[PDB]
Write a protein that binds this ligand. Sequence first.
Ligand SMILES: [Zn+2]
Lengths: 132, 314, 101
Amino acid sequence: HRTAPKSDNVYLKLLVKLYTFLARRTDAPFNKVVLKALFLSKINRPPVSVSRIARALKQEGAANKTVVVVGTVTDDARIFEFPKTTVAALRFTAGARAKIVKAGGECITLDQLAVRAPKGQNTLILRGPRNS
Amino acid sequence: SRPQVTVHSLTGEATANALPLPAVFSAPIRPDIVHTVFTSVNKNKRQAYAVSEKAAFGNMCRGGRMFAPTKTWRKWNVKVNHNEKRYATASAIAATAVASLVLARGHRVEKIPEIPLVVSTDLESIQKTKEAVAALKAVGAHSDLLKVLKSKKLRAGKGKYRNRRWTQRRGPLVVYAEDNGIVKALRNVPGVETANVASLNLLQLAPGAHLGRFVIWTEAAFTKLDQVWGSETVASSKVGYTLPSHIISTSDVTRIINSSEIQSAIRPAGQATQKRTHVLKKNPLKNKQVLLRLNPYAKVFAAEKLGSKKAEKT
Amino acid sequence: SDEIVWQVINQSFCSHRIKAPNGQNFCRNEYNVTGLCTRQSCPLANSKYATVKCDNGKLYLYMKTPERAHTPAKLWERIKLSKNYTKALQQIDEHLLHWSK
RNA sequence: CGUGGAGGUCAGUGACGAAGCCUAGACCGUAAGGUCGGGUCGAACGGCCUCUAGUGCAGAUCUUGGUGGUAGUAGCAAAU
RNA sequence: GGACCAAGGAGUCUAACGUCUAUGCGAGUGUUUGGGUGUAAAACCCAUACGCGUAGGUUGGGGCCUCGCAAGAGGUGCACAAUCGACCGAUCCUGAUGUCUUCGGAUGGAUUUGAGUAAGAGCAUAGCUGUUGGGACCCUGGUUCCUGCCGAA
RNA sequence: CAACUUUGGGGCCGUUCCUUGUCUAUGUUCCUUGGAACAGGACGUCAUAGAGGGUGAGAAUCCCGUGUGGCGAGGAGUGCGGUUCUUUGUAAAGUGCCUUCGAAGAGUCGAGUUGUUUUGCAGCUCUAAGUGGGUGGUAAAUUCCAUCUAAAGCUAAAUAUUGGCGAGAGACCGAUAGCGAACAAGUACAGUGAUGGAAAGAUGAAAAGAACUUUGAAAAGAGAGUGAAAAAGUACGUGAAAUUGUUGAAAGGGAAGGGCAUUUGAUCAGACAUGGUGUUUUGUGCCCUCUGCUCCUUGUGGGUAGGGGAAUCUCGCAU
Ligand SMILES: [Zn+2]
């Protein structure tokens, strides 16, 4: 479909340049997935609730994994207990950002994510549940 | 990204006091959003126009009614999301610090003390034009003023005789906390426009949607910018507003690429331009050198001459 | 910020940039070494920079450091070049030691 | 690609000649078109990044204006 | 359909739903009826309301991890899909404990049901476009620049 | 009954409002070009005035204004602010308590019908009540409760305004557009009338609008002259195409057009090109030496003076 972001956010195009350097110069399929996810529209980037993130952290062997969201991490007050984990994403709503910080966790940008996992070591990628 | 900025005297020199950055200059710079907001804001001060209602009968006809009589109820003003408009203003304010942007727009700021240029609040208390112009001489924005003054040209359009006769470039923008006669003093000099910190007009900020007009700050205004936009320390003074975040922390991508650890994790690179192989086909069965890069048996084949070999008489 | 400043200068209005009939671009930036307005070329988009430039008679090497991104009056450093052509090229290679090609 | 207008910019061009017109003058564009020479001419006008539209004509027995042949013909109050 | 030539001359605007895209914020979102402010039809700030939305298993499977020189193996598994479930509402029978003589639904069934639960995604602005209506391209006829790509009945 | 509490009317002068009048900055400094500087360059001054216009071309500084304030003048006037003159006569009013009373919209309400409207209104006929009447919920019901006073009247402001009287603006049109009408446009004209309804802007800075001679009925010329320009002559800025005339060239003889390709003929373009490398001569300077001064970005810096020397070296320049 898109071979380029149809957006004109400059910082987004910067991350596209960074991850296209990675997706050329790495052999992990991770950065290719990240590049293909960066092209997605607002409909094709559905938001991810932090409740869905914690329900994802209920998976086996994932507690020392990091989570990556190409999209927006949104808050949900329907959860109380949220684990201390590391979340990297594009955008953070201030409620979800305070949930992650208040749980002792970490709000990460995708540049710092690339610095931490250039080959995508020990990661998780979550997609929002699209209906319409 | 330095912590603080030296205030400058009206005589123009490094005053010993310095002021920390108001962290508004750390805002994301989004010229797409500045552009989209700027179009709609520039569509605001517009007066409608129309043809007469009933005043042959053909659009093709001489003197007939025209195709599509221009009606007043075509949309003139454009509604803008308030956070989005504030975001455009914040990106403009952050862009004014940089001054590679200010040179990139076109300003004569090559001999000014520093960026963002901050003068004492005593500047506000000037009430005469000649003193404030001499003050801007003492600053070093004189060349920008002379640029604006030379730049007065006549408008090429018909709108010359629609009360829009003359045109000229824009110059410095003076930001004050409080008027003390400064806005009357700078009113007569061309190209200079003053602004309270509360307003900070985007049209005055990024004229023509080009980021980074040359902006002069007074000392109290520069402190007051923290009050106006907030920080992580000072709240906002705007109801439920936050100085917005970055999606990428480091502004330099090539720094990240060439850092150390990406440079550790990455395979070796190519020649950075491709070595052309086989630019032209050399046929075998002639050109015996390319026959010899193939089939090394061909040499001893020709040596023994097996193509003309005599069989046994059996 | 340099790549942000560059993409502003590139994708939006570089005031020094001139558009040729060919399509090629040209900065009227007085410090620009090549005539062009490209990524390496704009002095506004790069903080480490250098330029041979003449004041009335004598030719000066002009150095630009990221250390002086602020204070643009004190921005450019000036070096008097020798009248010996060989010596002045040697001076260039000295002051641009550990510097890019 | 072109047109009117608008914001920014080129401290753009211009009475030592802008715009327009002509050009059995040259050039660049695949083209839409653009650039220059020369002549005429007298007062404004362009390039770039954007905005905006009353924005592109061969026809519609289109509208208006101008000019042909018919034809020195018909014909002599065809208007005088 | 045409004597020629010049100029003018034909899909504009608006309203209501709809897709797509971009942007801001995000379970919220929407300043501009209005008030305050102003260098004054601009910009700037905003009280109260209002609008719209919100209020289990198995099989895979992007990847990721481990091991393996590699090939491959094992594990955890995004989105989404299929299955088997469960529950809610309905569906038609069972009709208890009680029962004001006609009230009652307890329990157990049965199929489908549903943009159902089983952990949100929307609001606003802009752009391009689809349908409808306002004279709505102009008056059967006409309907204004180029190039590239795709291209039927 | 007890107290308290209160007084109205003028004048005048200000103020307020309207209508005006008047005053209130800074170059016409040198040079070039131009018919004309208001253009270009150099040097300036004002500014709470760099809006706009005019002046022979883009005028802050030439003029009018503009901006800031000032001084008037004539009215309107009770809006209030001072003064000043008077106003009482058992005058008028207000609050609490006590006592005694304690009167209101009828051809209306309503009902029927008809028309009209989508329930009112109108007509016709009938036509009331006074703890009354109107209207709405309510019910565990021989209900309760709610809420107003119709059939008399006035009332600013927030509102509409394609008219009037004025202003101020425009991402509007620039003479086939924009009003039909930028002009002696509702005109000329047409129609018996009601009515319909055009076309038509630009000499020049100044008319300086062509003295005078001559042809010529007269129209038009030709000499001449003005003008920066009649390649601006009241047919007049600029002056396209269609179409016309003359001359030149070529072709054709009842010939139509283009496309390719080439000759011939005519014709145009076609260096302000004239240097580099090495060596050598002499001279000069940021070259050498000595003695300084100065700016900070204080270094791998920048500017700059004086005298001496090339006798030797060396760089650049000139030769
Ligand atoms: Zn550039």
